[PDB]
Design a protein around this motif. Structure first.
Motif, mmCIF file in Angstrom:
data_model
loop_
_atom_site.group_PDB
_atom_site.id
_atom_site.type_symbol
_atom_site.label_atom_id
_atom_site.label_comp_id
_atom_site.label_asym_id
_atom_site.label_seq_id
_atom_site.Cartn_x
_atom_site.Cartn_y
_atom_site.Cartn_z
ATOM 1 N N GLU A 170 -39.722 57.096 45.465
ATOM 2 C CA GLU A 170 -40.431 58.025 46.361
ATOM 3 C C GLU A 170 -40.011 57.729 47.806
ATOM 4 O OE1 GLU A 170 -42.986 57.577 48.661
ATOM 5 O OE2 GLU A 170 -43.173 59.717 49.027
ATOM 6 N N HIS A 220 -36.425 59.207 49.105
ATOM 7 C CA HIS A 220 -36.254 60.646 49.426
ATOM 8 C C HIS A 220 -36.856 60.950 50.804
ATOM 9 C CE1 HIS A 220 -40.155 61.671 47.110
ATOM 10 N NE2 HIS A 220 -40.408 61.823 48.403
ATOM 11 N N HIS A 221 -37.109 59.929 51.614
ATOM 12 C CA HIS A 221 -37.553 60.103 53.015
ATOM 13 C C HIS A 221 -36.570 59.390 53.917
ATOM 14 C CE1 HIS A 221 -41.192 62.135 51.901
ATOM 15 N NE2 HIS A 221 -41.570 61.131 51.109
HETATM 16 ZN ZN LIG Z 1 -42.224 61.513 49.239
#
Ligand SMILES: [Zn+2]
Ligand SMILES: [Zn+2]
Ligand SMILES: [Zn+2]
Length: 136
Positions: A49, A52-53
């Motif tokens: 997670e 993807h930043h």
């Molecule tokens: Zn995210």
């Protein structure tokens, strides 16, 4: 593939900012094996997670008007992560520098070998959790 070392290739071509990350799984997840338990399962999900930043992993000045165009994440199971990020910076002239937050999200990384290719110059530098600045 050296644990605690991360490869970072930055290419700047017009409005195109492309950053590629080659990171061992030990750096990103804390281990390179199949998740033994639920803690490790969370470690893996938190990592994926996070990856993807790139706008959190690389501080791009708002003035540069950098919008995310590409997020590719490859997990090869040792075990390795390739992330490739593309920004389109409509005021790229105002992207003077990038301040990587990698070491904050993945503290078991000790050094990043950064390669920076722009229209003007190739340049190399080794980054650490205290020296995170990349000049463009
Ligand atoms: Zn995210
Ligand atoms: Zn390994
Ligand atoms: Zn543009």
């Amino acid at each position: 593939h050296v644990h605690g070392q991360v490869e970072l290739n930055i290419a700047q071509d017009g409005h195109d900012l492309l950053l590629e990350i080659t990171a061992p799984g030990a750096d990103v997840v804390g281990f390179e094996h199949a998740p033994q338990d639920d803690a490790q399962k969370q470690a893996l999900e938190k990592a994926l997670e996070t990856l993807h930043h790139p706008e959190k992993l690389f501080a791009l000045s708002d003035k540069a008007q950098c919008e995310k165009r590409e997020v590719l994440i490859k997990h090869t199971l040792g075990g390795s992560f390739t992330a490739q990020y593309q920004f389109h910076c409509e005021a790229v002239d105002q992207l003077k520098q990038i301040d990587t937050q990698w070491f904050q999200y993945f503290p078991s990384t000790e050094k990043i070998q950064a390669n920076v290719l722009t229209e003007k110059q190739q340049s190399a530098l080794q980054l650490n959790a205290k020296q995170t600045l990349i000049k463009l």
